[PDB]
Every structure is written in C-alpha cells, then in structure tokens.
C-alpha cells in the first residue's frame, strides 16, 4: 500500500480542517475558500483509495 495510507492520513487532516473553517466563516465569500480546502481533502482521500484500488490488481508491470 504505502503512500495510500499516507495520502489517507494527510487528506483527513485537510478535510477536517476545512470542516472546521466552513463553520467559522460562515456564509461570506471565504466560505467558498473553505469548500475548496474540503474538496482538496476529499480529493487526496480518493487519491489514496485509488492507489489502493490499483495495487489490489495491477494492470501493468514495472518492466
């Protein structure tokens, strides 16, 4: 797995952080900024899962 779990850890810290910020801002323009942070968090979550989903059954060899 490797970087899979690493991504999943990092992304959670980003996602939760955005969830903390979207409650503070809260309807201003910066709410959008908070959402973007949250999206990037979710992106890195899915990125980690995708890496796992590839190394579960790789369709390519490093040859």
């Amino acid at each position: 797995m490797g970087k899979s779990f690493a991504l999943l850890v990092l992304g959670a810290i980003i996602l939760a952080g955005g969830v903390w910020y979207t409650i503070e801002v809260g309807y201003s323009v910066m709410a959008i900024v908070a959402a973007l942070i949250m999206a990037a968090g979710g992106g890195i979550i899915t990125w980690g899962l995708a890496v796992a989903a590839d190394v579960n059954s790789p369709t390519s060899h490093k040859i």
Binding site: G26, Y27, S28, V29, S57
Partner: protein, 331 residues
C-alpha cells in the same frame, strides 16, 4: 393512486423528499410516486447487483485460478430469452401507463364545481391576485359575487387596437392586454412585500393563470403541481384554468416561479395562506366594504399575521447580501 404507500420510515424514504400534499389529488400523486419508486428500487437493486456479480464472480483471474482456460463459452444468441426480456418491459410500461392515465385524468379534470375562482397575473417579476368569482355560500352579503372592475376591464379591452393604426397581429395591436383580468379586490406583489393569497379550507377552488409579458409558472410544492402562465393563453392553446377539489388543512405555503423569465426569476415568490371558511368570508367582506384597505390590514382583521411567513422579500441591494443576510424583515 388510491392505495396508500407503506408509511413509516419506509414511506419517508420512498417518497424521497416529496411534501405530504395539502389536496386530495396531491395525495393521489404522492401515492403513485411512492409505488413507482418501490418498482424502480427493485430494478435498480437487481441490476446493480448484476454489475457487482460481474466484478466478483466473472473475473478472468478467478476463472484462471480454477482452470477455466483462455476463453469463456462463446455464446451469442438465446432467441427465447432475448424475446422474453423485451416483452416483459412492454407489459411493465403498459401497466405504468394505465395508472398514469388514471392519475392524470383525476388531476387534470375541470369538473370539480369551483366555489372560489382566483385570477392570477404574472409579470416581470411578481404576482397579482384577484377574486373573479365567489359563490354565495361564503360570499360577501350571500349573493354570488363577481369581481370584475368594469371600467378598468373596459380600458384593457379597448387597448386591443391602436387608434394610430399600427395593428399588425391578425388585426390586433401588438400590446393587446384584453386577455388580462382586472378585479376590485386585488393583492399586488412588490419588491418590498410578498403577495399573500388568502383562500378557504375544504372548498373547491379554481385558478386562472396568465402573464403580462413572458412565460412564468405557478409552482406550489404543497400542491405537488405546477402550470405555465402564458401571455395570450388562447392563441397558444394553453389551458389557462385548473381546479382543486379542496385544500385539506390550513396554514401558510410557499410558491415559486418555475419557468425561466429573466433577471429576478429567483425573487418572484408568493404565499398561499389558507384559513377557515368563515374567516375567509370575514376577510372578503372586510375587503369588499372598504376597498382602500390593504392586504396586511385584512389579514390582521381576521387574526392572522400581516405578512408572509413561509417566504420573505429579498434585499434589493445588489451587494448587501454578500455576507449571508439576504432577507429584509417586516413589522
């Protein structure tokens, strides 16, 4: 549909966000909706399950680790099964169409014996309500009440032709407004005030729609129904009246414009407030006696809040709403 849904949390899931519906025909449509979702979830579950079976059983590594070889069984045709799987959908959609026709014919009928007729006018970008007919049993005085303002209706009727002769549309003037309705008791929405249409409970009602310029749409989500309001509805062959057998329960209900009409399309809201039968008789008597009085004062007079509650007017300032507070309050 006559049959009620399963109810409980299962019914709440099945109706998938629909309001309960404040009319009998709204109940019929909601029933039909929940049952067609029972059907739809069956289809979706079994076919997503097939797409999962493809992932977890029909793989090539699973087939090779148990010695199936290089290729599968090269089957391509099964005339009976590919007939049956086509004929079953047909007999499914025929039953769906039967129930569809039943519900549509109940909702769309125009023989519900209306007791209150409201003339609705849409324009860019608000609503105008007026009582065309109020049959005697709740009317002011007891005599069957007609609402037309003859002088103003006659001015609109005379605007049907240009005296200067610019009459291009089949002999009529381009700015003809003789299709619009003008009544004595009217409520006119503004940027500062939501128009609140007062109606009675347990009474058959007729709505008569039209627009002053551009197409609009009269969507009350609690009726589970909407219709487009057009300019010159008869030239478009658009049936401009619809009827409900009753509103079952009283309260305040939001209504929105559901057809794109331009800049302030999202700000064209109205309220449909529903009150007791005798309370409605009092409201219409008050308004008919002292026609200078406003809508809020009559609402106060029958013991209701002066202004809309299910919705509010928007702050017209183009920047003040930037930090969330886009609603302006009333006394």
């Amino acid at each position: 549909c006559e049959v009620a849904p399963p109810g409980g949390v299962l019914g709440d899931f099945l109706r998938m966000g629909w309001p309960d519906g404040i009319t009998p025909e709204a109940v019929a449509m909601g029933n039909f909706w929940s049952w067609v979702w029972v059907a739809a979830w069956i289809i979706g579950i079994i076919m997503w399950g097939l797409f999962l079976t493809a992932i977890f059983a029909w793989g090539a590594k699973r087939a090779e680790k148990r010695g199936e070889g290089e290729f599968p069984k090269q089957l391509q045709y099964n005339v009976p099964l590919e007939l049956v799987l086509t004929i079953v959908p047909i007999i499914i959609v025929m039953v769906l169409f039967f129930f569809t026709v039943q519900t549509q014919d109940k909702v769309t009928a125009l023989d519900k014996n209306p007791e209150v007729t409201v003339d609705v006018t849409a324009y860019q970008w608000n609503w105008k309500f007026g009582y065309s007919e109020i049959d005697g049993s709740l009317a002011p005085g007891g005599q069957d009440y007609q609402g037309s303002d003859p002088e103003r209706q006659a001015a609109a009727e005379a605007s049907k032709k240009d005296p200067s002769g610019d009459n291009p549309i089949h002999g009529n003037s381009k700015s003809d407004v003789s299709y619009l309705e003008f009544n004595r008791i009217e409520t006119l929405g503004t940027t500062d005030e939501i128009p609140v249409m007062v109606l009675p409970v347990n009474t058959p009602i007729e709505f008569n729609l039209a627009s002053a310029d551009v197409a609009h749409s009269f969507w009350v989500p609690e009726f589970l129904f909407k219709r487009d309001a057009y300019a010159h509805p008869e030239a478009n062959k658009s049936q401009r009246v619809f009827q409900i057998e009753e509103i079952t329960e009283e309260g305040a209900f939001v209504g929105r414009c559901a057809e794109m009409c331009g800049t302030y399309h999202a700000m064209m809201n109205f309220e449909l407030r529903v009150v007791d039968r005798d309370s409605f008789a009092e409201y219409i008597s008050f308004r008919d006696s002292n026609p200078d009085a406003t809508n809020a004062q009559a609402l106060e007079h029958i013991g209701q809040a002066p202004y809309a509650t299910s919705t509010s007017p928007f702050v017209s300032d183009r920047t003040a709403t930037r930090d969330g507070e886009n609603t302006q309050s009333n006394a």
